[PDB]
Write a protein that binds this ligand. Structure first.
Ligand SMILES: CN(C)c1cc(CN2CCOCC2)nc2nc(NCc3ccc(C(C)(C)C)cc3)nn12
Lengths: 339, 313
């Protein structure tokens, strides 16, 4: 989903930035004199596949010129994969590392300030609205980045170059993916999202309605609000697997319903934690980064609604067209300055 | 057979057998006192059938001298069912759930010795002599989580909550592992090693980076997608940590927003399990750098029924 941008190509080094996380590798590069920023994601699980993509990019977009390629690695996996990269690319110009936080924030601020049609709000009522951020300091800052990958990172940015980590969560995309993979057999994240879309969570969640007979207006909750995620399930050997889960249980619980339930559980939790962090830090604007929302309308509506609800309208969820690429973009910009 | 009991000089001015019931999503709790016994009797659970036996055994089968106070959603969802089930009773009344919990908690704090305690694996159990306070948070964990702020006697509000509560833990672990009781889940959790299903920091580069994050790792023309197995004990530990750490974090953030140091954990979640208590205590101790404190309660599951009981008189 390439972007037009006038890059400074410097000494013509080909800068190949990689953000390596728990689960995914996200790559940003610009062929020399193209003025195009290009973006790819691949799972890290099959090393050959990952390394092979990097090889193909060098061959297809830098004419096989290893000796003028600089790989800059960011994300948590920059450390773990450093030796794999070195052994794969003996003949390249260099390999460097960029701190994860600076990566995310440099990448995000770049997207906010420079790239049109990149930042957007979304909910089921309003549809998508592009926020024209790449048109000052006091309008943009302060903000929070909620970067959802395997876990959840939360960073606050008070002004240019002024940013820090605040507490994150271990209940992130990896949790949602792990649980639904094992429970439902779903083969890909995209499949889980399609099943979630069709599902009815109320068959496995207890709603306020199920516990009361009605709204619980004294505490601000409608009957349709979720009171206990997966709360309906209990009432109704060393190892478990999808197989055993299916043999034991059949279709008492339906896959679409499980997917929607847990999509709501994890996204609402993330939205709440984000809210609470924004509340403590007196921040109105909350960006979502990572590869969790993937422009999925249900997911974005869920997150937007959680921030809106918990804040009673005083805070706002923002999404990014290149959400997954913030870290790699920041690394890219560092290597660019260098060359 | 009642095995949980407190001596207390109850007020029997009305010459009524007060029977308080907390009808929550998943569990039902009773608090009652045989007239003039000075014994408070507690029971957690075919339920309506229990209430009958209680009247039979502890009030001589006398319906016309029994008063029921109902708290929780059942009280409203099923107000009629109580009248259908308990005709000819002296009276049925209701008590609002949040107010139930706080009156019950304040009673345990102020009146009952050896009720409030800290627990962690480092220093063990410490009884806090509260009965010898404000403001405080109550984090009441049942099917879901209710979080209440209490500034002073009779000043409180529900500030927050979470749908990721005991029912989520029990639900996930039932379906995934086939475990049949909360007890088996906790026993398995205590043996388990979460690192086989969780991505830890070390995995990305013993803190958890992603709970359960290691698990994900046209027409038919090749082999069946068919698969990988994970150990039940490790799954129970992963999800116990995930749900407990999250609750601890939300509790800490709420406490921070509300400028509260003292955080009480209520409901039927910890059940006196050292591992669960340790995890909650650790989470609060960690985030606050020691400036906030987790408290537990010997009668954690009966806060709401206790408050309802006291409302009768
Ligand atoms: C997910 N939403 C939208 C929210 C929002 C809030 C706080 N809001 C702040 C803004 O003003 C309105 C209130 N609290 C929430 N708690 C839950 N579930 C836990 C839960 C809900 C209900 C119950 C009973 C019925 C048994 C008492 C027990 C546990 N969800 N939830």
């Amino acid at each position: 989903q390439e972007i037009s941008y006038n890059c400074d190509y410097g000494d013509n080094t080909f800068n190949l930035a990689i953000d390596i996380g728990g689960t995914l590798a996200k790559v940003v590069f610009s062929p020399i004199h193209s003025n195009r920023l290009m973006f790819y994601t691949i799972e890290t699980e099959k090393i050959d596949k990952f390394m092979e993509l990097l090889h193909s990019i060098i061959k297809e977009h830098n004419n096989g010129c290893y000796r003028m390629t600089h790989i800059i690695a960011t994300g948590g996996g920059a450390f773990k994969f450093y030796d794999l990269l070195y052994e794969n690319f003996p003949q390249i110009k260099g390999i460097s590392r960029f701190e994860e936080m600076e990566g995310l924030i440099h990448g995000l601020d770049f997207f906010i300030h420079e790239i049109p049609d990149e930042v957007f709000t979304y909910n089921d009522q309003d549809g998508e609205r592009i926020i024209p951020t790449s048109s000052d300091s006091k309008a943009i800052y302060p903000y929070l980045l909620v970067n959802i990958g395997s876990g959840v990172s939360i960073l606050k940015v008070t002004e240019p170059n002024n940013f820090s980590r605040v507490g994150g969560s271990s209940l992130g995309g990896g949790t949602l993916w792990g649980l639904l993979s094992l429970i439902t057999g779903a083969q890909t994240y995209d499949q889980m999202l399609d099943w979630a879309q069709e599902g009815d969570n109320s068959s496995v969640d207890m709603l306020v309605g199920d516990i009361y007979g009605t709204d619980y207006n004294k505490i601000g909750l409608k009957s349709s609000a979720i009171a206990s995620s997966f709360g309906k399930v209990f009432q109704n050997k060393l190892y478990s697997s999808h197989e055993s889960i299916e043999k034991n249980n059949g279709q008492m619980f339906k896959n679409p319903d499980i997917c929607k339930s847990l999509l709501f559980a994890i996204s609402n939790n993330i939205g709440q934690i984000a809210y609470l962090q924004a509340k403590i830090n007196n921040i109105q604007n909350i960006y979502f980064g990572g590869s969790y929302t993937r422009g999925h309308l249900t997911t974005m509506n869920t997150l937007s609604y959680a921030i809106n609800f918990w804040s009673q309208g005083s805070k706002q969820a923002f999404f990014l067209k290149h959400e997954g690429y913030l870290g790699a973009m920041g690394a890219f910009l560092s290597a660019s300055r260098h060359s």
